[PDB]
Amino acid sequence: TSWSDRLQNAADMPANMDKHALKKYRREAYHRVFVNRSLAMEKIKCFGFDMDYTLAVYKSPEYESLGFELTVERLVSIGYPQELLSFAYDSTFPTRGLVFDTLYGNLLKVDAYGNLLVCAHGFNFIRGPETREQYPNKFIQRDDTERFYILNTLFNLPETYLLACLVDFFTNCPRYTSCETGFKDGDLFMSYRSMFQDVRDAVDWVHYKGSLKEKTVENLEKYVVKDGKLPLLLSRMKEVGKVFLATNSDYKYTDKIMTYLFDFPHGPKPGSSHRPWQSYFDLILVDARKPLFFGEGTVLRQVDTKTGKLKIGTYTGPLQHGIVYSGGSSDTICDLLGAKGKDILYIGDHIFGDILKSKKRQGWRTFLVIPELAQELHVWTDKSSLFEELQSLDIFLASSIQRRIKKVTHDMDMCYGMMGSLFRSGSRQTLFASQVMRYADLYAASFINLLYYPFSYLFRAAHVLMPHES
Amino acid sequence: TSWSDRLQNAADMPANMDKHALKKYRREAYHRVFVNRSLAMEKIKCFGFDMDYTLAVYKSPEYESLGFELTVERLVSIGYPQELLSFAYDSTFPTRGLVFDTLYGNLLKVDAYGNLLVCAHGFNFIRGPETREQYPNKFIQRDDTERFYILNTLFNLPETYLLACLVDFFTNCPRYTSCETGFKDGDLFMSYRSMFQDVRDAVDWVHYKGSLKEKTVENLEKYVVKDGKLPLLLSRMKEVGKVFLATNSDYKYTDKIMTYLFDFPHGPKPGSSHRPWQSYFDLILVDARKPLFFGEGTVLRQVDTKTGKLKIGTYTGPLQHGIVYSGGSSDTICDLLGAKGKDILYIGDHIFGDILKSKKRQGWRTFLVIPELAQELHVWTDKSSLFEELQSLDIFLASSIQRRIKKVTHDMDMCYGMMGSLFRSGSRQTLFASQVMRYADLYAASFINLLYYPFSYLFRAAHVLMPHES
Ligand SMILES: [Mg+2]
Ligand SMILES: [Mg+2]
Numbered sequence: 001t002s003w004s005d006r007l008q009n010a011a012d013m014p015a016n017m018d019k020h021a022l023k024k025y026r027r028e029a030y031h032r033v034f035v036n037r038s039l040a041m042e043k044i045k046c047f048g049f050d051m052d053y054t055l056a057v058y059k060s061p062e063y064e065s066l067g068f069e070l071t072v073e074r075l076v077s078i079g080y081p082q083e084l085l086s087f088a089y090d091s092t093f094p095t096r097g098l099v100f101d102t103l104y105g106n107l108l109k110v111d112a113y114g115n116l117l118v119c120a121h122g123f124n125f126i127r128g129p130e131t132r133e134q135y136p137n138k139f140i141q142r143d144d145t146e147r148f149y150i151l152n153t154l155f156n157l158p159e160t161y162l163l164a165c166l167v168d169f170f171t172n173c174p175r176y177t178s179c180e181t182g183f184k185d186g187d188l189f190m191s192y193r194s195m196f197q198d199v200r201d202a203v204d205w206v207h208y209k210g211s212l213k214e215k216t217v218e219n220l221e222k223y224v225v226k227d228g229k230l231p232l233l234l235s236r237m238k239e240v241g242k243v244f245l246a247t248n249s250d251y252k253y254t255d256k257i258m259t260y261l262f263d264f265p266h267g268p269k270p271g272s273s274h275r276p277w278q279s280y281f282d283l284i285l286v287d288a289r290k291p292l293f294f295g296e297g298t299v300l301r302q303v304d305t306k307t308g309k310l311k312i313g314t315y316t317g318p319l320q321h322g323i324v325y326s327g328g329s330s331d332t333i334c335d336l337l338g339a340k341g342k343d344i345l346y347i348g349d350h351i352f353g354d355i356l357k358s359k360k361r362q363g364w365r366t367f368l369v370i371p372e373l374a375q376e377l378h379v380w381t382d383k384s385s386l387f388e389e390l391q392s393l394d395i396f397l398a399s400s401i402q403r404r405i406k407k408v409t410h411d412m413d414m415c416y417g418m419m420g421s422l423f424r425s426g427s428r429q430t431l432f433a434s435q436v437m438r439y440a441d442l443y444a445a446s447f448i449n450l451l452y453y454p455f456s457y458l459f460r461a462a463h464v465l466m467p468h469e470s
Numbered sequence: 471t472s473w474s475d476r477l478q479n480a481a482d483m484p485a486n487m488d489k490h491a492l493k494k495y496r497r498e499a500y501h502r503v504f505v506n507r508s509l510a511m512e513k514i515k516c517f518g519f520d521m522d523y524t525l526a527v528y529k530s531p532e533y534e535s536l537g538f539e540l541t542v543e544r545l546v547s548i549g550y551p552q553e554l555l556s557f558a559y560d561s562t563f564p565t566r567g568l569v570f571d572t573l574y575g576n577l578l579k580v581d582a583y584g585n586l587l588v589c590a591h592g593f594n595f596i597r598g599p600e601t602r603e604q605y606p607n608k609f610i611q612r613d614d615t616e617r618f619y620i621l622n623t624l625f626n627l628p629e630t631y632l633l634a635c636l637v638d639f640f641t642n643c644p645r646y647t648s649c650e651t652g653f654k655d656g657d658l659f660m661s662y663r664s665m666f667q668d669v670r671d672a673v674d675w676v677h678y679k680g681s682l683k684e685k686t687v688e689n690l691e692k693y694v695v696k697d698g699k700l701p702l703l704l705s706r707m708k709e710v711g712k713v714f715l716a717t718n719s720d721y722k723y724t725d726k727i728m729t730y731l732f733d734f735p736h737g738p739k740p741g742s743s744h745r746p747w748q749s750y751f752d753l754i755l756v757d758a759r760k761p762l763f764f765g766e767g768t769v770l771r772q773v774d775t776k777t778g779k780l781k782i783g784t785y786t787g788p789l790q791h792g793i794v795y796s797g798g799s800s801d802t803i804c805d806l807l808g809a810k811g812k813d814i815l816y817i818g819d820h821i822f823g824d825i826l827k828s829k830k831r832q833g834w835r836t837f838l839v840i841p842e843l844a845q846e847l848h849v850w851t852d853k854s855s856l857f858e859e860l861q862s863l864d865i866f867l868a869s870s871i872q873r874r875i876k877k878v879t880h881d882m883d884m885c886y887g888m889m890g891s892l893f894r895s896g897s898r899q900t901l902f903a904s905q906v907m908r909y910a911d912l913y914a915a916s917f918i919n920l921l922y923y924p925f926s927y928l929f930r931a932a933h934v935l936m937p938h939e940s
Contacts, residue, residue, distance in 0.1 A: 034938045036937060113830075113833065137811040137833050139812070139832075141832075341609060359583065360583075360613070361611060362607075363584060363585065377938065380938070398928060423936060423939070437936060437937075443937075443938075461937070466504070466893060466903055466906065466907060467504040467931070468502075468847065468913075469850065
């Protein structure tokens with residue numbers, strides 16, 4: 001049972017809009033919207049969306065497996081060894097938000113301060129004392145972006161696993177000699193950095209120049225979660241405010257995915273006429289180039305929706321019905337919708353490019369979609385006894401207790417996968433968790449959970465007090 | 471009663487090291503060390519210090535008034551109008567950590583997200599609706615460092631007030647015409663930015679080329695808090711670890727201040743021989759250039775302590791007794807003391823240059839000294855009924871309540887001064903407060919509060935849980 005299985009099971013259910021039914025449903029963690037900072041829904045005038053892994057959640061592990069297979073085939077085609085073809089995607093290995101250290105070839109799980117929680121070289125998990133050789137302070141400087149790459153999106157799951165496969169492969173293949181910073185093969189030296197760059201390039205290529213999109217769209221039911229409640233929520237949002245799309249995807253791909261997401265024999269609710277996906281949006285913007293979008297952005301262009309090509313020139317005209325924009329900036333949205341940042345709730349899955357950047361650069365309100373939460377919630381509740389035990393031990397310690405703490409931490413983490421929870425390793429929160437709390441005003445397993453709250457709901461979070469104020 | 475008066479009253483008291491006396495004393499907020507993240511003191515191998523506003527806390531408002539007077543005199547001497555000489559420093563106006571907006575000439579008090587809590591143009595406090603003309607989203611992008619300057623240190627208190635005085639003066643002097651971005655005086659245009667730059671330059675000049683240091687050192691009792699307990703604490707630290715000084719001040723000024731700080735007829739305790747300040751440090755480093763110090767730093771130089779001049783050349787030798795360093799990097803300290811970052815507790819008052827940067831760049835443990843806390847604690851407890859009222863109203867609201875909330879917020883804030891608490895405006899925390907919580911592992915009114923805790927004390931903070939984990 002993957003997180004997408006959970007999401008699809010919930011997507012299959014019709015909306016019961018009886019107000020008591022709604023209250024009961026949203027009390028379940030699965031259908032709840034979680035609150036980091038208080039947000040009065042009555043003050044939101046514009047609801048903005050990302051598409052991929054927000055509106056269009058790709059099914060797991062099928063979509064990751066497809067990306068993996070095509071990325072491997074691209075690497076082989078440029079001259080990586082044939083043994084790569086014997087790799088098979090394994091969903092139990094990668095957790096999102098890991099850091100690849102391009103100097104030493106390690107996947108790292110870190111906290112908000114760059115402290116090492118987990119270090120794997122290939123499939124070898126390096127324990128504390130051994131990590132000190134390469135990380136003397138068990139710490140990385142994560143903003144050293146030339147060295148460290150943070151694998152922040154669900155698109156990075158395939159390459160997270162592939163990096164580990166490759167390091168494992170070269171390390172154990174007697175054709176190659178392992179060095180500190182890569183592999184020697186006679187007169188050829190392959191650094192972990194140049195290897196990482198090849199993987200990154202092959203991933204981009206598969207999405208942009210390869211067959212991934214074509215294979216996705218030829219079997220959308222296999223690859224994409226679909227939910228009859230989506231037009232209902234969007235139509236309700238449009239009753240109290242404006243609705244926009246701002247996506248990095250191009251027009252042709254957006255049109256294919258979005259058509260599928262609305263492809264039901266009805267519109268907002270069963271019995272109503274179907275309407276085109278475009279009719280649910282006051283403003284549609286593609287090729288957004290987030291996060292650059294939230295600063296200078298790019299030249300505002302107009303899509304010719306008939307051909308899917310951009311019209312020649314900068315678009316200087318007004319917002320008109322049926323127009324589709326390309327590029328621009330977040331200011332385009334504010335100016336055309338008559339909005340200020342705090343009137344906007346932007347809904348996306350990219351913790352950096354969607355959420356942190358719109359928050360820091362523009363003061364937008366933020367809603368983070370975390371698709372894996374759909375299944376992490378199940379583990380969290382099902383294994384609560386292990387977390388509680390750890391919480392009791394930590395308090396008792398403040399030795400056989402220290403070893404017990406390490407053992408319980410391991411058992412708890414393994415319930416999530418080999419790289420543990422997205423949100424923690426034992427009692428230590430990850431960088432990703434800390435960024436969620438600081439930048440996402442609201443978060444949930446799905447944006448659909450907004451449907452279960454009334455129009456002027458006040459999302460509440462307790463005030464933060466300093467230690468001396470307590 | 472200023473915060474320095476509180477600090478000096480406590481400094482005047484002898485240390486009672488009876489273990490029960492110690493426990494009782496540190497329970498008082500004034501003498502407490504506050505904990506943002508748990509820290510096991512037994513793991514600290516090196517204790518590092520800043521000097522100014524850390525070891526050498528300057529007396530308030532006398533020191534600010536001296537800086538102000540000399541800065542004004544410097545501005546007049548370069549051609550600012552004579553009316554500046556009628557300004558007098560007023561401690562009730564500035565709060566630390568305000569943001570000067572160089573485009574519009576406003577002092578801003580903001581939260582961690584750039585939201586406006588207070589906006590003053592001169593001594594005119596602009597209320598919410600009027601701030602929207604210049605700040606349509608009541609928000610600034612604070613990392614736009616070309617536009618916004620954060621007045622982060624106690625050295626910036628004089629210029630905080632002076633900026634307000636100047637804006638007030640030009641606005642109300644009929645020789646000048648007020649524009650959006652500065653003042654016209656016939657064929658001369660003075661932007662708020664060029665005005666701000668003149669103030670900033672005059673402040674630097676007074677410290678570097680003017681008479682401020684000379685006037686400080688000629689009357690150290692008037693200007694500097696002195697405490698017989700300082701050598702006691704340092705000598706205890708030296709029993710369990712290494713002690714270093716890393717300061718931006720130069721050798722001659724450091725030597726004058728430090729001599730005064732140790733100038734008692736005894737050493738660590740009454741009855742013991744006096745020892746030179748240098749003997750309390752395993753490593754002494756001046757001209758540190760923090761925060762650059764915590765990255766590449768500068769060339770490591772050796773001070774000729776006889777002349778106060780640098781020896782010619784890069785110092786390539788070992789740590790030797792009596793040597794004094796200049797420049798270098800934080801790696802100099804780790805390499806010479808045999809330390810890793812998490813073995814180091816660095817003690818300073820500069821939230822950015824001392825604390826945030828050593829934490830983010832190096833993974834050092836951090837202790838933030840907040841001298842104003844000495845008096846903010848008194849107001850916090852004395853006016854607790856106003857904060858409690860506000861907390862009850864906020865909860866009741868979740869109208870005459872909204873107006874009551876604004877009135878109580880104002881009354882509470884005014885108890886601290888015209889720009890309110892360093893830590894909040896009503897129920898909203900400032901940027902400074904949020905940075906304290908995120909980057910300072912420990913904080914206190916004075917570093918001396920460490921004396922009241924035993925050698926292997928475990929400072930405890932509760933674990934943070936995400937909303938879905940609660
Ligand atoms: Mg996305
Ligand atoms: Mg200082």
